[PDB]
Amino acid sequence: PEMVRGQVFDVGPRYTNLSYIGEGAYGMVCSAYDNVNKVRVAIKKISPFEHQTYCQRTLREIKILLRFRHENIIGINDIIRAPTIEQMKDVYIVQDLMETDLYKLLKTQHLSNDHICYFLYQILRGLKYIHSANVLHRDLKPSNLLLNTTCDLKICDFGLARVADPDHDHTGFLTEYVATRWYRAPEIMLNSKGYTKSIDIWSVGCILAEMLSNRPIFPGKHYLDQLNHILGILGSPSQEDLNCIINLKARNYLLSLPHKNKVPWNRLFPNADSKALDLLDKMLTFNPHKRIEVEQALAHPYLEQYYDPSDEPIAEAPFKFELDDLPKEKLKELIFEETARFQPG
Numbered sequence: 273p274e275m276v277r278g279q280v281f282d283v284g285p286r287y288t289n290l291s292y293i294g295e296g297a298y299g300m301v302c303s304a305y306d307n308v309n310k311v312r313v314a315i316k317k318i319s320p321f322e323h324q325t326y327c328q329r330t331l332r333e334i335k336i337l338l339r340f341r342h343e344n345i346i347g348i349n350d351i352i353r354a355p356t357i358e359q360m361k362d363v364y365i366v367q368d369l370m371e372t373d374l375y376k377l378l379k380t381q382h383l384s385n386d387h388i389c390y391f392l393y394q395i396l397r398g399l400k401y402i403h404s405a406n407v408l409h410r411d412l413k414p415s416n417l418l419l420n421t422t423c424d425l426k427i428c429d430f431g432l433a434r435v436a437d438p439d440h441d442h443t444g445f446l447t448e449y450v451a452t453r454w455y456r457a458p459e460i461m462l463n464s465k466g467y468t469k470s471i472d473i474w475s476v477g478c479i480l481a482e483m484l485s486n487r488p489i490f491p492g493k494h495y496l497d498q499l500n501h502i503l504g505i506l507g508s509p510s511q512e513d514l515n516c517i518i519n520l521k522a523r524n525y526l527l528s529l530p531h532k533n534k535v536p537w538n539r540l541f542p543n544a545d546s547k548a549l550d551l552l553d554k555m556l557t558f559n560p561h562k563r564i565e566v567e568q569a570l571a572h573p574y575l576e577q578y579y580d581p582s583d584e585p586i587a588e589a590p591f592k593f594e595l596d597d598l599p600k601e602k603l604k605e606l607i608f609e610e611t612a613r614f615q616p617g
């Protein structure tokens with residue numbers, strides 16, 4: 273078999289001429305020539321069966337992405353694994369190959385207002401579909417937005433995604449959380465388990481802000497520093513928004529802080545389109561109940577040149593699947609079952 277940077281890449285006969293793309297905790301990714309469709313593809317090798325939480329992510333990723341079909345959501349084209357559970361140590365997930373991601377693009381490229389508008393439109397168009405399936409992405413960030421050579425955008429990495437559960441969203445103050453720090457909504461640190469659609473809109477707000485300046489808007493250096501940054505720009509919460517936080521630890525923390533005034537968006541972003549800043553403000557609302565929803569965001573005047581609800585599809589039914597209690601050994605079985613459709617047969 274072909275190897276790349278040490279690892280065996282058992283992807284043939286269909287996929288040949290591998291080039292290394294990158295690596296992480298997930299595994300390793302290469303481009304490969306697909307000998308059926310005659311295009312290069314992305315292939316990521318995942319080796320998760322020795323820890324339950326890698327199994328969870330892999331299964332969430334697989335189940336969600338096979339059910340979803342949308343232009344602004346990365347699909348799964350093919351999955352390669354051994355023919356038996358016993359022999360299955362790796363899963364190879366085949367996906368459309370994208371030129372870059374919004375993280376890499378933001379470190380080197382100034383975005384025109386027309387690019388920001390188009391990228392924001394596509395994020396929200398994909399997110400409309402996600403939310404319509406009652407799913408929360410929960411880790412939206414520049415590196416999870418893939419881009420092709422014509423700036424078409426696809427949301428990727430559904431391994432932290434959850435079915436929405438707003439009746440069980442409440443928790444205590446400083447309750448530990450998994451998703452990416454700079455894009456975490458203020459309520460995560462105060463009283464939310466991150467089980468409502470509003471968590472994703474916050475992350476989109478952060479991404480909008482970052483597109484306007486090429487710098488993260490709330491670059492907290494650790495867990496409660498993240499609220500420090502947030503409140504440094506939004507200013508102190510209003511009496512009404514505070515009264516919505518019934519948890520006493522969280523409310524009294526907020527009351528203990530000196531009063532801070534709102535930094536106006538147009539001084540933080542002096543060159544930004546004023547409509548973009550109005551939408552930003554509505555996505556970066558402190559109170560999650562008052563935060564704009566995806567369909568409202570799409571209908572915002574900033575996006576008028578693209579808004580077309582008949583061309584912003586929704587999912588055919590809500591998604592349902594839970595996984596926290598299931599062992600490593602059951603999750604292997606489910607990944608095996610979920611990938612069977614791709615086997616010769």
Ligand SMILES: O=C(CN1Cc2ccc(-c3nc(NC4CCOCC4)ncc3Cl)cc2C1=O)N[C@H](CO)c1ccccc1
Binds near residue numbers: 325329346430
């Ligand atoms: O799978 C992932 C996360 N990842 C990693 C990755 C790498 C590359 C591409 C990708 N990249 C490109 N092009 C690139 C060209 C170079 O510039 C950048 C873009 N084109 C297409 C794709 Cl799909 C996509 C992904 C993705 O979704 N994590 C699973 C589930 O959470 C997981 C499972 C178990 C434990 C931990 C995590």
